[PDB]
Amino acid sequence: LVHVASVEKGRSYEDFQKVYNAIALKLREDDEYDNYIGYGPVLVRLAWHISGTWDKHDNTGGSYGGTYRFKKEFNDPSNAGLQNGFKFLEPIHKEFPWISSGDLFSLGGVTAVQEMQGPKIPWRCGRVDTPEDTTPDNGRLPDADKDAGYVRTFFQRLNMNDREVVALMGAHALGKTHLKNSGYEGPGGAANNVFTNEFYLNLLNEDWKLEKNDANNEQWDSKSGYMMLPTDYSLIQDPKYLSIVKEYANDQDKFFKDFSKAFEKLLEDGITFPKDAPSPFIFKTLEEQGL
Numbered sequence: 001l002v003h004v005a006s007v008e009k010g011r012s013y014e015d016f017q018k019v020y021n022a023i024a025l026k027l028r029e030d031d032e033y034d035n036y037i038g039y040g041p042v043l044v045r046l047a048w049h050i051s052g053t054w055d056k057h058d059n060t061g062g063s064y065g066g067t068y069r070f071k072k073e074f075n076d077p078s079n080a081g082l083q084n085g086f087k088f089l090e091p092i093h094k095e096f097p098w099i100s101s102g103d104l105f106s107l108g109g110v111t112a113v114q115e116m117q118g119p120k121i122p123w124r125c126g127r128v129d130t131p132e133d134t135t136p137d138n139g140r141l142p143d144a145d146k147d148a149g150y151v152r153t154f155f156q157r158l159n160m161n162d163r164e165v166v167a168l169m170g171a172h173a174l175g176k177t178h179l180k181n182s183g184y185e186g187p188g189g190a191a192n193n194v195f196t197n198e199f200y201l202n203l204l205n206e207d208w209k210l211e212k213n214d215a216n217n218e219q220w221d222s223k224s225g226y227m228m229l230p231t232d233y234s235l236i237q238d239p240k241y242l243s244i245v246k247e248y249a250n251d252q253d254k255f256f257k258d259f260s261k262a263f264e265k266l267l268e269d270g271i272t273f274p275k276d277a278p279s280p281f282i283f284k285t286l287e288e289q290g291l
């Protein structure tokens with residue numbers, strides 16, 4: 001399967017910076033969502049789940065085709081709760097009907113991270129919508145109730161290595177688990193709509209307790225009111241993972257730099273970019289624009 005990036009006709013940096021600003025302006029406006037967390041965390045989760053279907057072996061799945069717009073992927077049990085990120089973006093797609101679905105879902109994730117004061121993420125245009133029959137089947141996204149060997153093995157399919165996996169998981173400092181979506185409940189920290197390295201700090205400094213929640217699932221709970229998933233706590237159980245966790249709890253700039261590279265790579269897996277294709281765009285935030 002080859003998927004070649006095709007820039008939307010005649011579009012350039014300024015067009016996509018207009019779509020960025022539209023998403024970012026609505027993130028500021030619709031602030032009440034999920035008890036004032038706002039839409040940013042569900043939008044970086046949506047960009048991860050449309051990319052996380054990729055399989056390196058046959059180049060199926062991935063962010064290129066925008067296939068989450070089809071019922072099979074929209075109704076995947078693993079995507080429960082992401083309909084709220086879709087409905088947030090649907091106004092903006094009506095306003096810029098020329099951007100492809102893959103591009104709009106991935107730029108929403110980029111915009112949310114930078115607007116929640118994360119690192120800049122280089123983003124590239126050119127994903128092309130593909131037919132309903134290209135939609136990957138349910139079951140390619142990871143279970144939460146498993147251990148470190150499962151996480152390592154699952155992420156080899158998206159060929160991410162240990163460092164990349166640990167840098168990507170730092171995004172679980174954002175938002176929260178919702179019992180009616182996943183059977184898990186609670187936030188992982190106090191700053192859950194500002195991008196920081198707090199996931200790593202909480203993992204190493206809190207007093208975790210294995211408890212059973214109302215959906216009868218086990219999760220790691222702390223006195224402070226935070227929770228960690230079994231696959232999250234996995235990172236301090238494995239010796240290779242645990243020493244990268246310590247590296248990111250001791251250096252927030254290295255965390256930001258490595259997250260930026262692994263999230264771009266995540267979003268680009270499966271796509272062939274021609275050598276005459278434009279460079280990756282670095283978008284300015286509303287704040288850097290005085291907007």
Ligand code: HEM
Nearest residue numbers: 041042045048081142143144168171175176177178181182
């Ligand atoms: C083995 C890996 C992973 C598993 C099992 C997993 C699982 C989960 C689960 C069960 C939730 C709760 C969903 C809900 O109830 O609403 C969640 C939320 C979230 N995850 Fe993951 N995740 C994984 C990796 C990642 C990665 C790599 C990213 C992003 C780079 C990510 C970003 C998020 C975000 C931002 C949320 C919060 C959503 C919200 O607030 O609504 N996840 N994760």
Ligand SMILES: c1cc[n+]2cc[nH]c2c1
Nearest residue numbers: 172175176177187188227
């Ligand atoms: C997903 C979203 C939020 N949190 C908080 C701790 N772990 C996780 C996973």
